[PDB]
A paper describes a structure:
EcMenH adopts a typical α/β-hydrolase fold, comprising a core β-sheet of mostly parallel strands surrounded on both sides by α-helices. As is characteristic of the α/β-hydrolases the three catalytic triad residues (Ser86, His232, Asp210) are located on loops of the core α/β–domain.
Accordingly, we report the structure of the MenH from E. coli at 2.75 Å resolution, along with the structures of two active site mutant enzymes, Arg124Ala and Tyr85Phe, both at 2.5 Å resolution. Structural comparisons of native EcMenH with the two mutant structures, R124A and Y85F using SSM shows they overlay very closely, with rms differences of 0.26–0.61 Å in Cα-atom positions over the entire structure. This shows that the mutations do not affect the polypeptide conformation significantly. In addition, 5–6 residues of the N-terminal His6 tag could be modeled for two of the chains in all the I4122 structures and in all chains of the Tyr85Phe C2 mutant structure. Mutation of either one of them may not compromise binding, especially as other residues such as Tyr148 and Arg168 could then become involved, but such mutations could compromise productive binding, thereby affecting catalysis. If, as suggested, substrate binding is required before the catalytic triad can become active, Tyr85, which binds to both substrate and His232, could play a key role in activation of catalysis. The structure is not perturbed by the mutations.
Numbering used by the authors: -4 to 251
The structure:
Amino acid sequence: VPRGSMILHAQAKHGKPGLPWLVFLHGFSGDCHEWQEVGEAFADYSRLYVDLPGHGGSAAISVDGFDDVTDLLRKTLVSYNILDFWLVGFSLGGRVAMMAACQGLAGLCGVIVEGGHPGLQNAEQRAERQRSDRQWVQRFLTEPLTAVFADWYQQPVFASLNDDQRRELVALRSNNNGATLAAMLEATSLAVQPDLRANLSARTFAFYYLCGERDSKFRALAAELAADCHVIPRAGHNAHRENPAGVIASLAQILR
Ligand SMILES: [Cl-]
Ligand SMILES: [Cl-]
C-alpha cells in the first residue's frame, strides 16, 4: 500500500444485510490477523480487519499523531461505505478507538476496548512515559526486532505469560520493521495522549471494556471507568489470544 495512501490497508468480510460492521484494530507490533480468530465467530456481522500506520499493509504510512490516525481511519470507513459500525480495539488499537470516537465518528454504534489505557492522570506521568518510550524507540531504530521483542514481552504488563507463549509472540512480532514501528510508537505514544476520562464520562456513544483476568494493570484502570468491564478468565493483557472462547462470549453479551 503506498506511503502517501489516504486509506489504511484492511481485510473485509461481509455478513448479514441488517447487521453493523465490526471494525477491528490491533495493538503495537500486531496486524489485521490479530482479531481474526475471534472476529470469524461473528460471521453474521460484516468484519473489517484494519492495519494501523507502521503495521502490516499500512507499514509505509507515517503519521504525526492521533489526528492523522483518526483522519485515515475515518477515510478508510468511507472507502468500504461503512455507515453503522462498532470500533473493537486492542491495547494501542483501543487507544486509537477512544481517541477517534471522542473526536467524532459519524455512524459509530459503540466502542469495545480491550486493555486500552484511557490516559495518564497528568503531565508529570506523560513526561516520564515520553522518557520511557524514547528508550524503546531507540532500541527499535538500532536492534534486531527479535532482540527488542524479547525484552518487550518481559514488561510487567506481560508477566503472566510463560516462556513458550513469549517465544511464539517474539517470533510473530519480528515480522515487522523497527523504523515504522518506532515512528508509530512515537506518533501515538501514551505520553502524547490526553486523559480521556472526562470525555468517556460525557460520551454520546456506547462504551464497553474487556480485560484479561491476569491483567491487574488494565483491570485497575477499568474500575475508574463508568463502562461495563468483561473480565476474561485465564488470560493476560492479550485476552483475545489466550482465551478466544472467553472473549467471543463477552462480545455476544454486548452485541447479540
Ligand atoms: Cl501482544
Ligand atoms: Cl496461548
